[PDB]
Design a protein around this ligand. Structure first.
Ligand code: PLP
Length: 464
């Protein structure tokens, strides 16, 4: 059935369930399918008319290698996307004659990480149950990821989740989503320290091998194969709305750690006809500079109005590097060794050409992003958040061809009201079902920034 191999070539070859629990490989690499499941044009035509859930079952099942029985998989996919307050799950809104926005923000935290998290948490619950295990999920957030994680893992049977965030330094909306979920297996830890301090405590816990063992610790991050896998689906559903497979479709993705756009690459590898895949970056433009020059070189991180894309390095870019080098693990090891030692590497000509043959990249500054929010509101009556506006700006600059362009809208404007207001004067409004959010009771524990204090809290409260 399906096996999973590391980008660094010397880790155990794993089945789906293990790849899901392993996370990062033994050799320091990232897991990828040994081969991609394939869909012919007729097999894609056969998806026409199907619900989001039905397309998800078709597209994702081959990746699970027969390890999750069909009835169980078509409960957990149904339940995952039942949390999205939109019948289409991820609907298109047309913004110009050949341009559409794919709204990934109808889920429980109004942001695109819900798509993968809501299924990942259920798949993990199932795998753990099947092995008679439990897990203690631990992560640090500046606000947004923690919410998505807590809304996904809240109320799962086999996990307890602990998210550390900086006391007094999270936006009101973001904090309330972490702390008012009402679930008994959720623990929001407000650390008397900054985001970097929260990350250091998490790294501390993961380095404490006895602690990890005793608590069955597992991480929240962008590099597990199951944060990426579910995202393949909406490339299919969007492209089917626009006539797949009989015409190719292009996508622009506001991109930070590359997992989103890598899922689009995966869709293409599976047979979805895709013309352009366009990386859209903020002022932290390592990926844009990489496509221009081949020089993936770390520079200082700028704070922008699209903070979820404020990256120094792109955590899943390594997955594309592996594919671009024809799965030459030694080449990938070399480049990553270079990054670690010297802060950059240069991609050689053949793999760089392979990347450029399928991807392009552009950037949007804070002012350009604001200008895009204001013009799209003015011309269409349509309100973008800043991350999504980056996508629209870059899509319009970089699009080439006759294919329809789908721009991924990765957050609701109400998630970043300051930047939206600054750009266009509108104070965005929360969806009606969330209109009470600011009145929900918060419930969180303030802890000092000390590894032993946090470990004791986790030890006391985890059921693991
Ligand atoms: C995480 C995030 C991105 C970047 O996603 P990657 O898969 O890491 O490239 C873009 N926009 C928003 C709103 C996000 O939360």
């Amino acid at each position: 059935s399906m096996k999973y191999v590391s980008t660094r070539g010397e880790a155990p070859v794993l089945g789906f369930s293990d790849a899901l629990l392993a996370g990062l490989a033994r050799d320091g690499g990232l897991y990828l399918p040994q081969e991609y499941p394939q869909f012919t044009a007729e097999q894609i035509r056969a998806l026409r008319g199907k619900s989001y859930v039905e397309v998800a079952l078709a597209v994702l099942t081959p990746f699970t290698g027969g390890e999750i029985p069909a009835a169980d998989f078509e409960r957990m996919v149904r339940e995952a996307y039942g949390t999205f307050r939109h019948d289409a799950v991820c609907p298109l809104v047309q913004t110009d004659a050949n341009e559409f926005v794919l709204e990934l923000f109808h889920g429980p935290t109004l942001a695109f990480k819900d798509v993968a998290m809501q299924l990942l948490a259920r798949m993990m619950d199932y795998v753990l149950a099947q092995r008679g295990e439990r897990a203690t999920i631990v992560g640090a957030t500046s606000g947004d990821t923690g919410g998505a994680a807590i809304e996904a893992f809240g109320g799962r049977d086999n996990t307890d989740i602990f998210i550390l965030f900086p006391n007094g330094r999270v936006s009101p909306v973001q904090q309330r989503q972490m702390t008012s979920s009402g679930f008994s297996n959720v623990h929001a830890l407000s650390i008397e320290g900054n985001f970097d301090d929260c990350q250091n405590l998490v790294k501390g816990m993961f380095n404490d091998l006895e602690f990890c063992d005793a608590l069955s610790l597992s991480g929240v991050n962008s590099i597990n194969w199951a944060r990426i896998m579910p995202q393949v689906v909406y490339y299919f559903t969007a492209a089917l709305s626009l006539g797949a497979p009989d015409r190719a479709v292009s996508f622009t993705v506001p991109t930070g750690n590359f997992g989103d756009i890598f899922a689009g690459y995966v869709a293409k590898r599976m047979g979805l006809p895709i013309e352009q895949l366009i990386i859209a970056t903020n002022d932290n433009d390592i990926l844009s500079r990489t496509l221009e020059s081949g020089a993936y070189e770390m520079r200082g991180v700028a704070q922008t109005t699209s903070p979820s894309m404020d990256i120094q390095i792109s955590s899943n870019f390594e997955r594309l590097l592996f594919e671009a080098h024809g799965r030459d693990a030694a080449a990938v090891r070399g480049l990553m060794q270079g990054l670690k030692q010297s802060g950059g590497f240069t991609i050689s000509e053949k793999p760089l050409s392979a990347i450029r043959s399928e991807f392009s990249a552009g950037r949007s500054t804070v002012d350009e992003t604001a200008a895009t929010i204001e013009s799209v509101l003015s011309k269409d009556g349509y309100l973008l958040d800043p991350h999504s506006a980056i996508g629209v700006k870059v899509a319009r600059e970089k699009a080439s061809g006759t294919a329809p362009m789908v721009v991924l809208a990765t957050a609701h404007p109400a998630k970043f009201p300051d930047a939206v207001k600054a750009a266009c004067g509108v104070e965005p409004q929360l969806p009606a079902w969330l209109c009470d959010l600011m009145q929900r009771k918060e419930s969180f524990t303030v802890l000092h920034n000390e590894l032993k204090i946090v470990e004791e809290y986790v030890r006391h409260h985890s059921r693991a």
